[PDB]
Structure 1
Amino acid sequence: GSRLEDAVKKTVAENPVVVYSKTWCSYSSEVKSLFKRLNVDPLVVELDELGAQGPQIQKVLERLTGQHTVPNVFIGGKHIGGCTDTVKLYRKGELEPLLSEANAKK
């Protein structure tokens, strides 16, 4: 449990943009599209493709972020929120500078 938390923390530190996702979730597909449009290639972890580990990672995500929904977006090692939250940062003009500070590749 503490190792899983540690692994999540490393994941978000190793990658400019991380999206914890589920393949079927429209909001997740939507935030992935936004990143595609902004020429970012995030690390996408599909919780529904992880079997038993999926619910385990989500437990950790809820502890670290306060959020129980997907997508769970991180940029530059920092929790952003979900699709709607990410889109808010975009509309406000704050998203691209964050992606730059995170050195988002592509």
Structure 2
Amino acid sequence: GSRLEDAVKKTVAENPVVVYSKTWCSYSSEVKSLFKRLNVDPLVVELDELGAQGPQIQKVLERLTGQHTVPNVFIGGKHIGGCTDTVKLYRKGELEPLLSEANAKK
């Protein structure tokens, strides 16, 4: 449990952009397409592809972020929110500077 939380923290530290996703979730597909359009290749973790570990990671995500929905987006190691939250930062002109500060590749 503490190791899993640590693993999540490491994951978001190791990758400029992390998207905790489900393959079937339209909002996740939508935020993935935004990143594609901004020439960013995020680390995508598909919770529905991880079997028993999926709900365990979600428990950690709710504790760390206050969010129970997917996609759960992190940039530069910081929680962003979901698809609508990410798109808000985009419209506000804040997302691209965050991506460059996070050293997002591509």
TM-score normalized by the length of structure 2: 1.00
Deviation at 1:49, TM superposition (A): 0.1
Could you tell me how far apart the structure 1 residues matched to 2:90 and 2:60 are? 27
Query: Structure 1 vs Structure 2: percent identity of aligned residues?
Result: 100
What CA deviation, in whole Å up to 9, does each residue of 1:15-40 have, x standing for no partner? 00000000000000000000000000
Cα-Cα RMSD: 0.1
Could you tell me how far apart the structure 1 residues matched to 2:27 and 2:6 are? 26
Deviation at 1:72, TM superposition (A): 0.1
SS of 1:36's equivalent in the other structure is helix
Could you tell me how far apart the structure 1 residues matched to 2:8 and 2:92 are? 28
Deviation at 1:82, TM superposition (A): 0.1
- Runs of 4+ in structure 1 off by over 3 angstroms are none
Deviation at 1:53, TM superposition (A): 0.1
Could you tell me how far apart the structure 1 residues matched to 2:47 and 2:102 are? 24
Equivalent residue for 1:8?
8
SS of 1:11's equivalent in the other structure is helix
Deviation at 1:46, TM superposition (A): 0.0
SS of 2:93's equivalent in the other structure is coil
Deviation at 1:10, TM superposition (A): 0.1
Could you tell me how far apart the structure 1 residues matched to 2:97 and 2:51 are? 36
TM-score normalized by the length of structure 1: 1.00
Matches for 1:73-92 after TM superposition, within 5 Å: 73-92=73-92
Equivalent residue for 1:22?
22
> How many residues in Structure 1 have an aligned counterpart in Structure 2?
106
Equivalent residue for 2:37?
37
Could you tell me how far apart the structure 2 residues matched to 1:80 and 1:26 are? 18
Deviation at 1:45, TM superposition (A): 0.0
